[PDB]
Coordinates of N, CA and C and ligand atoms in Angstrom, one line a residue:
Chain T
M1 N 77.3 -125.0 49.6 CA 76.1 -124.5 48.9 C 76.4 -123.5 47.8
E2 N 75.8 -123.8 46.6 CA 76.1 -123.0 45.4 C 74.8 -122.9 44.5
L3 N 74.8 -121.9 43.7 CA 73.7 -121.7 42.7 C 73.9 -122.7 41.6
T4 N 72.9 -123.2 41.0 CA 73.0 -124.2 39.8 C 73.5 -123.3 38.6
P5 N 74.0 -124.0 37.5 CA 74.4 -123.2 36.3 C 73.2 -122.4 35.8
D6 N 72.0 -123.0 35.9 CA 70.8 -122.3 35.4 C 70.5 -121.0 36.2
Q7 N 70.6 -121.1 37.6 CA 70.4 -120.0 38.5 C 71.5 -118.9 38.3
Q8 N 72.7 -119.3 38.1 CA 73.9 -118.4 37.8 C 73.6 -117.6 36.6
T9 N 73.0 -118.3 35.5 CA 72.7 -117.7 34.3 C 71.6 -116.6 34.4
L10 N 70.5 -117.0 35.1 CA 69.4 -116.1 35.4 C 69.9 -114.9 36.2
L11 N 70.7 -115.1 37.3 CA 71.3 -114.0 38.0 C 72.1 -113.1 37.2
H12 N 73.0 -113.7 36.3 CA 73.9 -112.9 35.4 C 73.1 -111.9 34.6
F13 N 72.0 -112.4 33.9 CA 71.2 -111.6 33.0 C 70.6 -110.4 33.8
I14 N 70.1 -110.6 35.0 CA 69.5 -109.6 36.0 C 70.6 -108.6 36.3
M15 N 71.8 -109.1 36.8 CA 72.9 -108.2 37.2 C 73.4 -107.3 36.0
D16 N 73.5 -107.9 34.9 CA 73.9 -107.2 33.7 C 73.0 -106.0 33.3
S17 N 71.6 -106.3 33.4 CA 70.6 -105.3 33.1 C 70.6 -104.2 34.2
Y18 N 70.8 -104.6 35.5 CA 70.8 -103.7 36.6 C 72.0 -102.8 36.6
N19 N 73.2 -103.3 36.3 CA 74.5 -102.5 36.2 C 74.5 -101.4 35.1
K20 N 73.5 -101.4 34.2 CA 73.5 -100.5 33.1 C 73.1 -99.0 33.6
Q21 N 72.3 -98.9 34.7 CA 71.9 -97.7 35.3 C 73.1 -96.9 35.7
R22 N 73.1 -95.6 35.4 CA 74.2 -94.6 35.7 C 73.5 -93.2 35.6
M23 N 73.6 -92.5 36.7 CA 73.0 -91.1 36.8 C 73.7 -90.2 35.8
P24 N 73.0 -89.6 34.9 CA 73.7 -88.7 33.9 C 74.3 -87.5 34.6
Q25 N 75.4 -87.0 34.1 CA 76.1 -85.8 34.6 C 75.2 -84.6 34.8
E26 N 74.4 -84.3 33.8 CA 73.5 -83.1 33.8 C 72.6 -83.0 35.0
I27 N 72.0 -84.2 35.5 CA 71.2 -84.2 36.7 C 72.0 -84.0 38.0
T28 N 73.2 -84.7 38.1 CA 74.1 -84.5 39.2 C 74.6 -83.1 39.3
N29 N 74.8 -82.4 38.2 CA 75.3 -81.0 38.1 C 74.2 -80.1 38.6
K30 N 72.9 -80.4 38.3 CA 71.7 -79.6 38.8 C 71.6 -79.7 40.3
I31 N 71.8 -80.8 40.9 CA 71.7 -81.0 42.4 C 72.7 -80.1 43.1
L32 N 73.9 -79.8 42.4 CA 74.9 -79.0 42.9 C 74.7 -77.5 42.6
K33 N 74.4 -77.0 41.4 CA 74.3 -75.6 41.0 C 73.0 -74.9 41.1
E34 N 71.8 -75.6 40.9 CA 70.5 -74.9 40.9 C 70.2 -74.1 42.1
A35 N 69.4 -73.0 42.0 CA 69.0 -72.2 43.2 C 68.2 -73.1 44.2
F36 N 68.3 -72.8 45.4 CA 67.7 -73.5 46.5 C 66.3 -72.9 46.8
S37 N 65.4 -73.2 45.9 CA 64.0 -72.7 46.0 C 63.1 -73.9 45.8
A38 N 61.9 -73.8 46.4 CA 60.9 -74.9 46.3 C 60.6 -75.3 44.8
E39 N 60.5 -74.4 43.9 CA 60.2 -74.7 42.5 C 61.4 -75.3 41.8
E40 N 62.7 -74.8 42.0 CA 63.9 -75.4 41.4 C 64.2 -76.8 42.0
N41 N 63.9 -77.0 43.3 CA 64.1 -78.3 43.9 C 63.1 -79.3 43.4
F42 N 61.8 -78.9 43.3 CA 60.8 -79.8 42.7 C 61.1 -80.2 41.3
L43 N 61.5 -79.2 40.4 CA 61.9 -79.5 39.1 C 63.0 -80.6 39.0
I44 N 64.0 -80.5 39.8 CA 65.1 -81.5 39.9 C 64.5 -82.9 40.2
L45 N 63.6 -83.0 41.2 CA 63.0 -84.2 41.6 C 62.1 -84.8 40.5
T46 N 61.3 -84.0 39.7 CA 60.5 -84.4 38.6 C 61.3 -85.0 37.5
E47 N 62.5 -84.3 37.2 CA 63.4 -84.8 36.1 C 64.0 -86.2 36.5
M48 N 64.3 -86.3 37.8 CA 64.8 -87.6 38.3 C 63.8 -88.7 38.2
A49 N 62.5 -88.4 38.6 CA 61.4 -89.3 38.5 C 61.1 -89.7 37.1
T50 N 61.2 -88.8 36.1 CA 61.0 -89.0 34.7 C 62.0 -89.9 34.1
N51 N 63.3 -89.6 34.4 CA 64.4 -90.4 34.0 C 64.4 -91.8 34.5
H52 N 63.9 -92.0 35.8 CA 63.7 -93.3 36.4 C 62.7 -94.2 35.6
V53 N 61.7 -93.6 35.0 CA 60.7 -94.4 34.2 C 61.4 -95.0 33.0
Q54 N 62.3 -94.2 32.3 CA 63.0 -94.7 31.2 C 64.0 -95.8 31.6
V55 N 64.7 -95.6 32.8 CA 65.6 -96.5 33.3 C 64.9 -97.9 33.7
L56 N 63.7 -97.8 34.3 CA 62.9 -98.9 34.7 C 62.5 -99.8 33.4
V57 N 62.0 -99.1 32.4 CA 61.6 -99.9 31.1 C 62.7 -100.6 30.5
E58 N 63.9 -100.0 30.4 CA 65.1 -100.6 29.8 C 65.6 -101.8 30.7
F59 N 65.5 -101.7 32.0 CA 65.9 -102.8 32.9 C 64.9 -104.0 32.7
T60 N 63.6 -103.6 32.7 CA 62.5 -104.6 32.7 C 62.6 -105.5 31.4
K61 N 62.8 -104.8 30.2 CA 62.8 -105.4 28.9 C 63.8 -106.5 28.8
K62 N 65.0 -106.4 29.6 CA 66.0 -107.4 29.6 C 65.8 -108.5 30.6
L63 N 64.8 -108.4 31.4 CA 64.5 -109.5 32.5 C 64.1 -110.8 31.8
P64 N 64.8 -111.9 32.1 CA 64.4 -113.2 31.4 C 62.9 -113.5 31.5
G65 N 62.3 -113.6 30.3 CA 60.9 -114.0 30.1 C 60.0 -112.8 30.0
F66 N 60.4 -111.6 30.3 CA 59.5 -110.5 30.3 C 58.9 -110.3 28.9
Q67 N 59.8 -110.3 27.8 CA 59.4 -110.1 26.4 C 58.5 -111.3 25.9
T68 N 58.3 -112.4 26.7 CA 57.4 -113.5 26.4 C 56.0 -113.3 26.8
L69 N 55.8 -112.3 27.7 CA 54.5 -112.0 28.2 C 53.7 -111.2 27.2
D70 N 52.3 -111.3 27.3 CA 51.4 -110.6 26.5 C 51.7 -109.1 26.7
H71 N 51.6 -108.4 25.5 CA 51.9 -106.9 25.5 C 51.1 -106.1 26.6
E72 N 49.8 -106.4 26.8 CA 49.0 -105.7 27.8 C 49.5 -106.1 29.2
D73 N 50.0 -107.3 29.5 CA 50.5 -107.7 30.8 C 51.9 -107.0 31.0
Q74 N 52.7 -106.8 30.0 CA 54.0 -106.1 30.1 C 53.6 -104.7 30.6
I75 N 52.6 -104.0 30.0 CA 52.2 -102.7 30.5 C 51.7 -102.6 31.9
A76 N 50.8 -103.6 32.3 CA 50.2 -103.7 33.6 C 51.3 -103.9 34.7
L77 N 52.4 -104.7 34.4 CA 53.5 -104.9 35.3 C 54.3 -103.6 35.5
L78 N 54.6 -102.9 34.4 CA 55.3 -101.6 34.5 C 54.6 -100.6 35.3
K79 N 53.3 -100.4 35.0 CA 52.4 -99.4 35.7 C 52.3 -99.8 37.2
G80 N 52.1 -101.1 37.4 CA 52.0 -101.6 38.8 C 53.2 -101.4 39.7
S81 N 54.4 -101.5 39.1 CA 55.7 -101.5 39.9 C 56.4 -100.2 39.8
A82 N 56.0 -99.3 39.0 CA 56.8 -98.0 38.8 C 57.1 -97.2 40.0
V83 N 56.1 -97.1 40.9 CA 56.4 -96.3 42.2 C 57.3 -97.1 43.1
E84 N 57.0 -98.4 43.3 CA 57.9 -99.3 44.2 C 59.3 -99.4 43.7
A85 N 59.5 -99.6 42.3 CA 60.8 -99.7 41.7 C 61.6 -98.3 41.9
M86 N 60.9 -97.2 41.8 CA 61.5 -95.9 42.0 C 62.1 -95.7 43.4
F87 N 61.3 -96.0 44.4 CA 61.8 -95.9 45.8 C 62.9 -96.9 46.1
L88 N 62.9 -98.1 45.5 CA 64.0 -99.0 45.8 C 65.3 -98.5 45.2
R89 N 65.2 -98.0 43.9 CA 66.4 -97.5 43.2 C 66.9 -96.3 44.0
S90 N 66.0 -95.4 44.5 CA 66.2 -94.2 45.3 C 67.0 -94.6 46.6
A91 N 66.6 -95.6 47.3 CA 67.3 -96.1 48.5 C 68.7 -96.5 48.2
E92 N 69.0 -97.2 47.0 CA 70.3 -97.5 46.6 C 71.2 -96.3 46.3
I93 N 70.7 -95.4 45.5 CA 71.4 -94.2 45.1 C 71.7 -93.2 46.3
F94 N 70.7 -93.1 47.2 CA 70.9 -92.2 48.3 C 72.0 -92.8 49.3
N95 N 72.0 -94.2 49.5 CA 72.9 -94.9 50.4 C 74.2 -95.4 49.8
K96 N 74.3 -95.4 48.5 CA 75.6 -96.0 47.9 C 76.2 -95.2 46.7
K97 N 75.4 -94.7 45.7 CA 75.9 -94.1 44.5 C 76.4 -92.6 44.7
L98 N 75.5 -91.8 45.2 CA 75.8 -90.4 45.4 C 76.9 -90.1 46.5
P99 N 77.9 -89.2 46.3 CA 78.8 -88.9 47.3 C 78.1 -88.2 48.5
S100 N 78.7 -88.3 49.7 CA 78.1 -87.7 51.0 C 77.5 -86.3 50.8
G101 N 78.3 -85.4 50.2 CA 77.9 -84.0 50.0 C 76.7 -83.8 49.1
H102 N 76.7 -84.6 48.0 CA 75.7 -84.6 47.0 C 74.4 -85.2 47.5
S103 N 74.5 -86.3 48.3 CA 73.3 -86.9 49.0 C 72.7 -86.0 50.0
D104 N 73.6 -85.2 50.8 CA 73.2 -84.3 51.8 C 72.5 -83.1 51.1
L105 N 73.0 -82.7 49.9 CA 72.3 -81.6 49.2 C 71.0 -82.1 48.5
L106 N 71.0 -83.3 48.1 CA 69.7 -83.9 47.5 C 68.7 -84.0 48.6
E107 N 69.0 -84.5 49.8 CA 68.1 -84.5 50.9 C 67.6 -83.1 51.3
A108 N 68.5 -82.1 51.3 CA 68.1 -80.7 51.6 C 67.1 -80.2 50.6
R109 N 67.3 -80.6 49.3 CA 66.4 -80.3 48.2 C 65.1 -81.0 48.3
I110 N 65.1 -82.3 48.6 CA 63.8 -83.1 48.9 C 63.0 -82.5 50.0
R111 N 63.7 -82.1 51.1 CA 63.1 -81.5 52.3 C 62.6 -80.1 52.1
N112 N 63.0 -79.4 51.0 CA 62.6 -78.0 50.7 C 62.1 -78.0 49.3
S113 N 61.1 -78.9 48.9 CA 60.6 -79.0 47.6 C 59.1 -78.7 47.5
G114 N 58.5 -78.4 48.7 CA 57.1 -78.1 48.8 C 56.3 -79.4 49.1
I115 N 57.0 -80.5 49.2 CA 56.3 -81.8 49.5 C 56.2 -81.9 51.0
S116 N 55.0 -82.4 51.5 CA 54.6 -82.6 52.9 C 55.5 -83.6 53.6
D117 N 55.7 -83.5 55.0 CA 56.4 -84.4 55.8 C 55.7 -85.7 55.9
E118 N 54.4 -85.8 55.6 CA 53.6 -87.0 55.6 C 54.2 -88.0 54.6
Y119 N 54.8 -87.5 53.5 CA 55.4 -88.3 52.5 C 56.9 -88.4 52.7
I120 N 57.6 -87.3 53.1 CA 59.1 -87.2 53.3 C 59.5 -88.1 54.4
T121 N 58.8 -88.2 55.6 CA 59.2 -89.0 56.7 C 59.2 -90.5 56.4
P122 N 58.2 -91.2 55.9 CA 58.3 -92.6 55.5 C 59.4 -92.9 54.5
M123 N 59.6 -91.9 53.5 CA 60.7 -92.0 52.5 C 62.1 -92.2 53.2
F124 N 62.5 -91.2 54.0 CA 63.8 -91.3 54.7 C 63.8 -92.4 55.7
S125 N 62.7 -92.8 56.3 CA 62.6 -94.0 57.2 C 63.0 -95.3 56.5
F126 N 62.4 -95.4 55.2 CA 62.7 -96.5 54.3 C 64.2 -96.6 53.9
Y127 N 64.8 -95.4 53.6 CA 66.2 -95.4 53.2 C 67.1 -95.9 54.3
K128 N 66.9 -95.5 55.6 CA 67.6 -95.9 56.8 C 67.4 -97.4 57.0
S129 N 66.1 -97.9 56.9 CA 65.8 -99.3 57.0 C 66.5 -100.2 56.0
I130 N 66.6 -99.7 54.7 CA 67.3 -100.5 53.7 C 68.9 -100.4 54.0
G131 N 69.4 -99.3 54.4 CA 70.8 -99.1 54.8 C 71.2 -100.1 55.8
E132 N 70.4 -100.4 56.8 CA 70.6 -101.3 57.9 C 70.9 -102.7 57.4
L133 N 70.3 -103.2 56.3 CA 70.5 -104.5 55.8 C 71.8 -104.7 55.0
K134 N 72.5 -103.6 54.7 CA 73.8 -103.6 54.0 C 73.7 -104.5 52.8
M135 N 72.7 -104.3 51.9 CA 72.4 -105.0 50.8 C 73.5 -105.0 49.7
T136 N 73.7 -106.2 49.1 CA 74.7 -106.3 48.0 C 74.0 -105.9 46.7
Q137 N 74.8 -105.7 45.7 CA 74.3 -105.4 44.4 C 73.3 -106.5 43.8
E138 N 73.6 -107.8 44.1 CA 72.8 -108.9 43.7 C 71.5 -108.9 44.4
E139 N 71.5 -108.5 45.7 CA 70.2 -108.3 46.4 C 69.4 -107.2 45.9
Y140 N 70.0 -106.0 45.6 CA 69.2 -104.9 45.0 C 68.6 -105.3 43.6
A141 N 69.4 -105.9 42.7 CA 68.9 -106.3 41.4 C 67.8 -107.3 41.5
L142 N 68.0 -108.4 42.3 CA 66.9 -109.4 42.4 C 65.7 -108.8 43.1
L143 N 65.8 -108.0 44.1 CA 64.6 -107.4 44.8 C 63.9 -106.5 43.8
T144 N 64.6 -105.8 42.9 CA 64.0 -105.0 41.9 C 63.2 -105.9 40.9
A145 N 63.8 -107.0 40.4 CA 63.1 -107.9 39.5 C 61.9 -108.5 40.1
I146 N 61.9 -108.9 41.4 CA 60.8 -109.5 42.2 C 59.6 -108.5 42.3
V147 N 59.9 -107.2 42.5 CA 59.0 -106.1 42.6 C 58.3 -106.0 41.3
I148 N 59.1 -105.9 40.2 CA 58.5 -105.7 38.8 C 57.6 -106.9 38.4
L149 N 58.1 -108.1 38.6 CA 57.5 -109.3 38.2 C 56.5 -109.9 39.3
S150 N 55.7 -108.9 39.9 CA 54.7 -109.2 40.9 C 53.4 -109.8 40.2
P151 N 53.0 -111.0 40.4 CA 51.8 -111.6 39.8 C 50.5 -111.0 40.2
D152 N 50.4 -110.3 41.3 CA 49.1 -109.8 41.9 C 48.8 -108.3 41.5
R153 N 49.5 -107.8 40.5 CA 49.2 -106.4 40.1 C 47.8 -106.4 39.4
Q154 N 47.1 -105.2 39.5 CA 45.8 -105.1 38.9 C 46.0 -105.1 37.4
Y155 N 45.0 -105.7 36.7 CA 44.8 -105.8 35.2 C 45.8 -106.7 34.5
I156 N 46.4 -107.7 35.2 CA 47.2 -108.8 34.6 C 46.2 -109.8 34.1
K157 N 46.2 -110.2 32.8 CA 45.4 -111.3 32.3 C 45.9 -112.7 32.5
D158 N 47.2 -112.9 32.4 CA 47.8 -114.3 32.6 C 48.8 -114.2 33.8
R159 N 48.3 -114.3 35.0 CA 49.0 -114.3 36.2 C 50.0 -115.5 36.4
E160 N 49.5 -116.7 35.9 CA 50.3 -117.9 36.0 C 51.6 -117.7 35.3
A161 N 51.6 -117.0 34.1 CA 52.8 -116.7 33.4 C 53.8 -115.9 34.2
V162 N 53.3 -114.9 34.9 CA 54.1 -114.0 35.8 C 54.7 -114.7 36.9
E163 N 53.9 -115.6 37.6 CA 54.3 -116.5 38.7 C 55.5 -117.3 38.3
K164 N 55.5 -117.9 37.1 CA 56.5 -118.7 36.6 C 57.8 -118.0 36.4
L165 N 57.7 -116.6 36.2 CA 58.9 -115.8 36.1 C 59.4 -115.3 37.5
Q166 N 58.5 -115.1 38.4 CA 58.8 -114.6 39.8 C 59.4 -115.6 40.7
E167 N 58.8 -116.8 40.8 CA 59.2 -117.9 41.7 C 60.7 -118.2 41.6
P168 N 61.4 -118.4 40.4 CA 62.8 -118.7 40.3 C 63.7 -117.6 40.9
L169 N 63.2 -116.3 40.8 CA 64.0 -115.2 41.4 C 63.9 -115.2 42.9
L170 N 62.8 -115.5 43.5 CA 62.7 -115.7 45.0 C 63.5 -116.8 45.4
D171 N 63.6 -117.9 44.6 CA 64.4 -119.1 44.9 C 65.9 -118.7 44.9
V172 N 66.4 -118.0 43.9 CA 67.8 -117.5 43.8 C 68.1 -116.6 45.0
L173 N 67.2 -115.6 45.4 CA 67.4 -114.7 46.5 C 67.6 -115.5 47.8
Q174 N 66.6 -116.4 48.1 CA 66.7 -117.2 49.3 C 68.0 -118.0 49.4
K175 N 68.5 -118.6 48.2 CA 69.7 -119.3 48.2 C 71.0 -118.5 48.4
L176 N 71.0 -117.2 47.9 CA 72.1 -116.3 48.1 C 72.2 -115.9 49.6
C177 N 71.0 -115.8 50.3 CA 70.9 -115.6 51.8 C 71.6 -116.7 52.5
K178 N 71.3 -118.0 52.1 CA 71.8 -119.2 52.7 C 73.3 -119.3 52.5
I179 N 73.8 -118.9 51.3 CA 75.2 -119.0 50.9 C 76.1 -118.0 51.6
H180 N 75.6 -116.7 51.5 CA 76.4 -115.5 52.0 C 76.2 -115.1 53.5
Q181 N 75.0 -115.5 54.0 CA 74.7 -115.2 55.4 C 74.2 -116.4 56.2
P182 N 75.0 -117.5 56.2 CA 74.5 -118.7 56.9 C 74.3 -118.6 58.4
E183 N 75.0 -117.6 59.1 CA 74.9 -117.4 60.5 C 73.7 -116.4 60.8
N184 N 73.1 -115.9 59.8 CA 71.9 -115.0 59.9 C 70.7 -115.6 59.2
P185 N 70.0 -116.6 59.8 CA 68.8 -117.2 59.1 C 67.7 -116.3 58.8
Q186 N 67.6 -115.2 59.6 CA 66.5 -114.2 59.4 C 66.7 -113.2 58.3
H187 N 67.9 -113.3 57.6 CA 68.2 -112.4 56.5 C 67.2 -112.3 55.4
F188 N 66.7 -113.5 54.9 CA 65.7 -113.5 53.8 C 64.4 -112.8 54.3
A189 N 64.0 -113.1 55.6 CA 62.8 -112.5 56.2 C 62.9 -111.0 56.2
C190 N 64.1 -110.4 56.5 CA 64.4 -109.0 56.5 C 64.2 -108.4 55.1
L191 N 64.6 -109.1 54.0 CA 64.5 -108.7 52.7 C 63.0 -108.6 52.3
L192 N 62.2 -109.6 52.8 CA 60.8 -109.7 52.6 C 60.1 -108.5 53.2
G193 N 60.6 -108.1 54.4 CA 60.1 -106.9 55.1 C 60.2 -105.6 54.3
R194 N 61.1 -105.6 53.4 CA 61.3 -104.4 52.5 C 60.2 -104.4 51.4
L195 N 59.8 -105.6 50.9 CA 58.8 -105.7 49.9 C 57.5 -105.2 50.3
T196 N 57.1 -105.5 51.6 CA 55.8 -105.0 52.2 C 55.9 -103.5 52.5
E197 N 57.1 -103.0 53.0 CA 57.3 -101.6 53.3 C 57.2 -100.8 51.9
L198 N 57.8 -101.3 50.8 CA 57.7 -100.7 49.5 C 56.2 -100.5 49.1
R199 N 55.4 -101.5 49.3 CA 54.0 -101.4 48.9 C 53.2 -100.2 49.5
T200 N 53.6 -99.8 50.8 CA 53.0 -98.6 51.4 C 53.2 -97.3 50.7
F201 N 54.2 -97.2 49.8 CA 54.5 -96.0 49.0 C 53.4 -95.8 47.9
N202 N 52.7 -96.9 47.5 CA 51.7 -96.8 46.4 C 50.6 -95.8 46.9
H203 N 50.1 -95.9 48.1 CA 49.1 -95.0 48.7 C 49.7 -93.6 48.9
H204 N 50.9 -93.4 49.6 CA 51.6 -92.2 49.9 C 51.8 -91.4 48.6
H205 N 52.2 -92.1 47.5 CA 52.4 -91.5 46.2 C 51.1 -91.0 45.6
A206 N 50.1 -91.9 45.6 CA 48.7 -91.6 45.1 C 48.1 -90.3 45.7
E207 N 48.2 -90.2 47.0 CA 47.7 -89.1 47.8 C 48.4 -87.8 47.5
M208 N 49.8 -87.9 47.4 CA 50.7 -86.8 47.0 C 50.3 -86.2 45.6
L209 N 50.0 -87.1 44.7 CA 49.6 -86.7 43.3 C 48.2 -85.9 43.3
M210 N 47.3 -86.4 44.1 CA 45.9 -85.8 44.2 C 46.0 -84.4 44.9
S211 N 47.0 -84.2 45.7 CA 47.2 -82.9 46.4 C 47.7 -81.7 45.6
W212 N 48.0 -82.0 44.3 CA 48.5 -81.0 43.3 C 47.4 -80.2 42.6
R213 N 47.5 -78.9 42.5 CA 46.6 -78.0 41.8 C 47.2 -77.3 40.6
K214 N 54.1 -77.3 40.6 CA 54.0 -78.6 41.2 C 53.3 -79.6 40.3
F215 N 52.2 -79.2 39.5 CA 51.4 -80.1 38.6 C 52.3 -80.5 37.5
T216 N 52.5 -81.9 37.3 CA 53.3 -82.5 36.3 C 52.5 -83.5 35.4
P217 N 52.0 -83.0 34.3 CA 51.1 -83.8 33.5 C 51.6 -85.2 33.0
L218 N 52.9 -85.3 32.6 CA 53.5 -86.5 32.1 C 53.5 -87.6 33.2
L219 N 54.0 -87.3 34.4 CA 54.1 -88.3 35.5 C 52.7 -88.8 36.0
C220 N 51.7 -87.9 36.0 CA 50.4 -88.2 36.5 C 49.7 -89.3 35.6
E221 N 50.1 -89.3 34.3 CA 49.5 -90.3 33.3 C 50.1 -91.7 33.6
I222 N 51.4 -91.8 33.9 CA 52.1 -93.1 34.2 C 51.6 -93.7 35.5
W223 N 51.5 -92.9 36.5 CA 51.1 -93.3 37.9 C 49.6 -93.4 38.1
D224 N 48.8 -92.9 37.2 CA 47.3 -92.8 37.2 C 46.8 -91.8 38.3
Chain S
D1 N 45.6 -94.8 25.5 CA 46.1 -94.9 26.8 C 47.5 -95.6 26.9
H2 N 48.3 -95.2 28.0 CA 49.6 -95.8 28.3 C 50.6 -95.6 27.1
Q3 N 50.4 -94.5 26.4 CA 51.2 -94.1 25.2 C 52.7 -94.0 25.4
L4 N 53.2 -93.4 26.5 CA 54.6 -93.3 26.8 C 55.2 -94.7 27.0
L5 N 54.6 -95.5 27.9 CA 55.1 -96.9 28.3 C 55.2 -97.7 27.0
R6 N 54.2 -97.6 26.1 CA 54.1 -98.4 24.9 C 55.3 -98.0 24.0
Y7 N 55.6 -96.7 23.8 CA 56.7 -96.3 23.0 C 58.0 -96.8 23.6
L8 N 58.2 -96.6 24.9 CA 59.5 -97.1 25.6 C 59.7 -98.6 25.4
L9 N 58.6 -99.3 25.5 CA 58.6 -100.8 25.4 C 59.0 -101.2 24.0
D10 N 58.6 -100.5 23.0 CA 58.8 -100.8 21.6 C 60.3 -100.4 21.2
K11 N 60.8 -99.3 21.7 CA 62.1 -98.8 21.5 C 63.2 -99.8 22.0
Ligands
9NG1 O1 63.1 -90.9 41.5 C1 64.0 -90.7 42.4 N1 65.2 -91.4 42.4 C2 65.6 -92.4 41.5 C3 66.3 -92.2 40.2 C4 67.0 -93.3 39.7 C5 67.7 -93.2 38.5 C6 67.7 -92.0 37.8 C7 68.4 -92.0 36.5 N2 68.1 -91.2 35.4 N3 69.0 -91.5 34.5 N4 69.8 -92.4 34.9 N5 69.4 -92.7 36.1 C8 66.9 -90.9 38.3 C9 66.3 -91.0 39.5 C10 66.0 -91.0 43.5 C11 67.2 -91.4 44.0 C12 67.8 -90.8 45.1 C13 67.1 -89.8 45.8 BR1 67.8 -89.0 47.3 C14 65.8 -89.4 45.4 C15 65.3 -90.0 44.2 C16 63.9 -89.7 43.6 C17 62.7 -90.4 44.6 C18 61.4 -89.9 44.3 N6 61.4 -88.4 44.2 S1 60.1 -87.6 44.6 O2 60.6 -86.3 45.2 O3 59.3 -88.4 45.5 C19 59.1 -87.1 43.3 C20 59.1 -85.9 42.7 C21 58.1 -85.9 41.6 C22 57.5 -87.0 41.5 S2 57.9 -88.2 42.6 C23 62.1 -88.0 43.0 C24 63.6 -88.3 43.1

């Protein structure tokens, strides 16, 4: 079992766009040096969330066919996926990119940022759940593309156009599960389990934003 | 509306 040359080409474009992300030194240094107070911890999180929006747009722009979509549909997809894409990238950075000590300090900062356990608990439950699947880089990149190119987001005018871009990605992901995990037929079902779990963050994030009187004007406009 | 996303998308 192998990917077709067309599938290999689609995957390469996705992987290339995904591998561009790299946490800048200034943010990493802040996690280490800043005072351990609710306001300093929250500011670090806000900067990370803001930087992710820029990272998300750059990744999305290079997804095959994205630039062929109507301008308003490009905006609707970005707005619709911003929270889910953020948590998925977070799961990867917490479980793979940051060193043990830095991730331990970032978790300490997240847990002492003035954010309620109602939102912190499902967040860390999700990271552990993603960690269990021992996802490859190809799995992270494809899952991110599938999340972004979701045809059922609100305010999309040409859904059929989005469906034509999403279906080949789901096909590639299922085929990689059959190639790399043939002894584990439930592997693709497990990856799907993460897509639905990611959707639950849309509510948790919306409630968290309405709870502010901490107030970050820029992020509130992107997430509505 | 969506002024930041519009700018990032054009850049
Ligand atoms: O967004 C996150 N990310 C992703 C991320 C990805 C890439 C870049 C980046 N920038 N430049 N290059 N790469 C930055 C951040 C990430 C990664 C690991 C952990 Br632990 C945590 C995070 C947060 C999760 C959401 N929280 S949050 O506390 O819920 C919040 C506060 C205010 C609004 S939402 C913020 C931090």
